[PDB]
Design a protein around this nucleic acid. Structure first.
Ligand SMILES: Nc1ncnc2c1ncn2[C@@H]1O[C@H](COP(=O)(O)CP(=O)(O)OP(=O)(O)O)[C@@H](O)[C@H]1O
Ligand SMILES: Nc1ncnc2c1ncn2[C@@H]1O[C@H](COP(=O)(O)CP(=O)(O)OP(=O)(O)O)[C@@H](O)[C@H]1O
Ligand SMILES: [Mg+2]
Ligand SMILES: [Mg+2]
Lengths: 430, 430
RNA sequence: GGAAGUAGAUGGUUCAAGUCCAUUUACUUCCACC
RNA sequence: GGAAGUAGAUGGUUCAAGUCCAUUUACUUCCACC
């Protein structure tokens, strides 16, 4: 293992030229910011030298007096960000900031309140300067351990707390390194994590809770792992077990429509997608909506007895796809409806008063009716469901589905940019 | 209602010529029996004049000393029966008797023990002479009420306690008339019977029990309605409710393969039969076995996710048919198998060590595997099931299935003598 | 023959079976055939 | 935007809904976007 981690360091540590680029970009930022007479602080991974090789982003925090309105922070912050970056983008879900580039390096310029105590925070980002002060004199010397953890997580698709990933944030990685001492110790101990593991770095303690909870040393009410999904927690624990069993440098490194067609026909399942235009909204808004829409349709498919197996979704540049595989390609038109016990004649009368095609029957002490379905395939079902229940499939996703959707299968489906997702959904290997 | 019951009397009461035939057959039996110096007693419906018009059978009971072996009763009883009847058949499940004809009338000649007290009975039939003594001076004058109840039950397929029917015995009908006073009172009160109704004629009482129970005034441990099915009890109660709501003389009176084909295709269901040679055994042995075989296959169909709707069975002269209708004509080859929670690595290791086609996955905190079915249709499934599980489908039925069976559907099935059963199974009306 | 129960022994399946699919011994009832 | 909760109002389905499919008002958190 020790030999592998040596090799892995070459993948996670920035070389002298990349470090040089960062420092020069930092120096230029300070120069631009000092010219404006702005109050700022460097925070995050650049300021701690815990950033992953090839993935540098400098965080500059603009410190505003607590009295300022939320609207002043965005106006003033966006104004400063734009004046200070070579090129810029402004795109966010709630908390305002400017993304840009200085001397080839990515930068976020972020307005925040200058608080004493990261308690009753005023903006969403107010803890961040306190994270830095806390980590400052604790992370020193353990930089490459953090970089190993980040690289391990990134190579396995579970790095980042954003909705798209629902994984481990960079800050969480730093806290784990402070807690365990090193990447290897983190990985060894994570093998024994449960869905009820509470890690409290400030108290130097692991206990049991209602949920997986890593308490922010800056804010004991804050779960740093709040947005780590159960399944992704499960993935990391499993990965840690595998790595220790058979340590591989491959842990640190990240089909033709014809074969996919044959696999689907081998499975004998109904495979299809709902396709609609992607709403022009940020990822952090879009993905939870794609998750909701996918779940609502899945649940419809289950209560309709199509026996859905799994679901998946994918957003391309212009379209979104909700993907489903079902055990039932076609169900009978007739089904049975449960009626009352033979005993209560009031409800039996009412149950039998319905005009039906097929004459109700007594079985095991109760009345039952044959009834007719409006659809017999999972595709016909989803068409009905998505057309009438658009409004429950996410604010923007539901509105887009209301404007246009189509259900795709077969040769037509395997031509869509969804092949990676389909393979993962069906556990296709090789 | 009173007018209908007047008309109905003409259907249930034997005319003077049929009564005359019975009396002459009785006189001839006595003459044949007296010539042999045999000890006998007339019992049952002929002896009480409670027999249904057109359905006369005389019961002659041979009274043997209690000390006699079971084998002497059969040998001696069969010997006497044969000497005394014009023609005869000997066919029974357990308790020996001879069926025959004297002067055009059906007769059962039955050996029984001459007990004091119908307690700790020695043969299955030992209560019968006591039933007669009990009913003798209680049923007098209410003969036609009994005949109305018998006729009502017979016209609706629930007369007789034998396994083929699982309904109301003639003796049960007599007890109900003694309890309620008349057919109309029986029918009025039966509307309020439940699956827990206990009727105790000897005590003049209705109470609540664990099950529907009519206590034999001759034997308080005996449930006269022991073999009345829950569903047939339910049928009678419902029928009683209908009759009182809309009294009809029709209550007392008992499809082309092409239309049936269209109905099945309208339903979109899988309809098929298991066909095998009828074992050469009595009804009372056969029917419970047909019931078992039908249930075992149904249960297989349910746990295999073919969503069976109902089942039915029919014995012809030479074949037996087990009939099934399923919502699922074809299921996918792939299905999901539930594995362990991500937490216990011992069981996860073992779950993942199985060589599979399709790579297991984590969902909601636990491992799942894709697995492949050996069959994809309910017919393929039953073929597999009946070929390997013949031994659990009844002693004789299972052995016959082991020798030969076939699964039939479509045009081929609608040509079998099973159309009545199929219509009833699917609630076909008109 | 079928059903219910009591005690015991097994095979298969399954990550895991007293708990699912089956096999089997002993004992106790009960039902249908009147 | 998404999630959880507290209180209230509705439509549909159903023999029967506080209990299923949905709609909606007020209030309390929480998460992602750093
Ligand atoms: N979801 C979240 N939870 C907790 N803290 C967060 C956070 N997002 C941002 N932060 C804080 O803001 C700092 C900067 O965040 P980012 O720039 O998004 C990532 P980073 O921690 O610098 O590491 P990375 O660039 O190596 O991924 C973090 O170090 C952390 O203090
Ligand atoms: N399953 C059963 N339960 C209770 N008593 C039964 C019985 N089978 C037969 N008996 C007794 O034996 C008598 C003769 O029975 P069966 O001849 O089979 C019918 P029955 O009662 O004479 O009426 P039926 O000929 O109008 O149907 C009955 O009257 C009853 O006393
Ligand atoms: Mg950064
Ligand atoms: Mg008779």
């Amino acid at each position: 293992v020790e030999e592998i981690l040596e090799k892995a360091l070459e993948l996670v540590i920035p070389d002298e030229e990349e470090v040089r680029k960062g420092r020069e970009a930092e120096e230029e930022l300070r120069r631009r910011l000092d010219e404006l007479g702005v109050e700022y602080v460097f925070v995050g991974s650049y300021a701690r030298n815990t950033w992953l090789k090839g993935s540098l982003e400098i965080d500059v925090f603009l410190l505003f007096p607590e009295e300022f309105s939320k609207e002043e922070l965005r106006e003033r912050g966006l104004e400063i960000g734009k004046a200070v970056l070579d090129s810029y983008e402004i795109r966010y879900a709630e908390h305002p900031y400017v993304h840009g580039v200085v001397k080839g390096v990515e930068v976020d310029v972020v307005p925040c309140y200058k608080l004493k105590e990261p308690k009753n925070i005023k903006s969403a980002v107010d803890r961040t300067p306190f994270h830095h002060k806390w980590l400052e004199g604790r992370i020193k010397g353990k930089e490459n351990e953090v970089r190993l953890l980040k690289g391990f997580l990134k190579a396995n698709g579970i790095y980042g707390a954003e909705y798209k990933v629902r994984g481990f944030s960079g800050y969480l990685c730093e806290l784990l390194i402070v807690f365990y001492g090193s990447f290897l110790e983190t990985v060894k101990n994570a093998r024994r994590w449960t869905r009820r593991t509470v890690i409290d770095v400030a108290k130097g303690e692991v206990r049991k809770g209602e949920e997986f909870f890593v308490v922010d040393p800056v804010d004991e009410k804050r779960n740093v792992a709040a947005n780590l999904s159960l399944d992704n927690l499960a993935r990391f624990v499993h990965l840690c077990r595998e790595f220790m069993e058979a340590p591989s440098l491959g842990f640190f490194k990240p089909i033709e429509p014809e074969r996919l067609r044959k696999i689907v026909e081998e499975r004998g399942t109904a495979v299809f997608a709902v396709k609609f235009r992607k709403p022009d909204i940020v990822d952090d808004n879009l993905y939870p909506q794609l998750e909701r829409a996918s779940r609502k349709i899945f649940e419809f498919l289950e209560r309709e007895n199509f026996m859905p197996l799994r679901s998946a979704f994918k957003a391309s540049e212009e379209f979104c796809y909700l993907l489903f595989e079902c055990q039932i390609k076609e169900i009978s038109r007739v089904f049975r409806r449960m009626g009352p016990q033979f005993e209560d004649e009031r409800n039996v009368k009412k149950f039998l008063s319905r005009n039906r095609a097929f004459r109700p029957f007594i079985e095991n002490g109760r009345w039952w009716a044959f009834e007719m379905r409006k659809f017999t395939t999972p595709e016909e079902g989803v068409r009905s469901y998505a057309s009438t229940h658009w409004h429950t499939l996410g604010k923007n996703v539901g509105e887009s589905i209301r404007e246009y959707f189509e259900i795709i299968s077969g040769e037509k489906l395997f031509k869509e940019p969804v092949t990676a997702e389909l393979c993962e959904m069906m556990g296709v290997k090789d």
